[PDB]
Amino acid sequence: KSLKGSRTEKNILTAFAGESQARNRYNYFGGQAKKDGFVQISDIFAETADQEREHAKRLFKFLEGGDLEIVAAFPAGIIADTHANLIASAAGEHHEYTEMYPSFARIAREEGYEEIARVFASIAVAEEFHEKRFLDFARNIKEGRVFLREQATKWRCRNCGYVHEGTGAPELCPACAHPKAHFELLGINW
């Protein structure tokens, strides 16, 4: 059926509004992680910002109407150091998949919108991996393990693809001469 005048109609707009602000906050956090010397984290923030654009797009494509009043609480700010930014983003993520989307998928079901309840539950799966990624990175920073491990691995320069073998990323990449900030652990996922 129609969406107009349901509680799910107001919940889709609230989810779109919260996601639109998260897209912006993650891009801002992405800029600050670049300035903190964490390029791989900067790009994860930007990738996540982008994924928030897409969850907000799927939601928005259900809406059919005009103006709608929302009552809702949002984080009133703060761009801090990258560790705090990672912790505040895991928290926001945390609330979405444990509270907001559960609740919204449940109301959609009650109202006869099973396909939207489906989409709401499916976004939550994505929101869980995002929180886990922010938490592992926050933990790496705090322990001082971003650029140095206990056992020797392969480190890749994200700027030129140079692979380095060692316990830690070199101070400057020898191929492109960009600093340590550009290195990540080498990953293979094919």
Added chain:
Amino acid sequence: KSLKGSRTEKNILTAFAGESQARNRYNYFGGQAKKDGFVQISDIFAETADQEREHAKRLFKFLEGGDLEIVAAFPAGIIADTHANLIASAAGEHHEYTEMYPSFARIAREEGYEEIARVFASIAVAEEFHEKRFLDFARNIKEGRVFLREQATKWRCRNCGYVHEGTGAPELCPACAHPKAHFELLGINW
């Protein structure tokens, strides 16, 4: 010392010219992999194109002069299906780290340019991982293993970050409704 009138001077320009064309070919190949339904491969081509920009930048920053004549053979074309594109790119990669850069680093040494011989040898390391990545992907296509494995894993939608558990990627992502083409094996490298 100065670079002008050395064989290394002509070799840096030849390497810059070959890399500049590889940046373009990998971006073209990147567009065709998108049309073939391989988004993760499309983005690796684009990432590699970008890394070729940076190797070419480090090289170019050594040059000091005016015009210089190059005699050199280059691939005179062809944008084909993605598998052939992956095989032709591994080959080009292959020739760079086994023949071109070895030889150029060796001549630079002979001539008293040890730091450029250093940079030439270091780019080759990057060129080896690029060939290995193109070959594993070409092999995945050919065996039909891009979107389906024999044992059950976790598949991630690159468009919205939805994580799926199964032997194969779903036909449409349930969170963003984008097709199979968007999925990759879930990777963790932190």
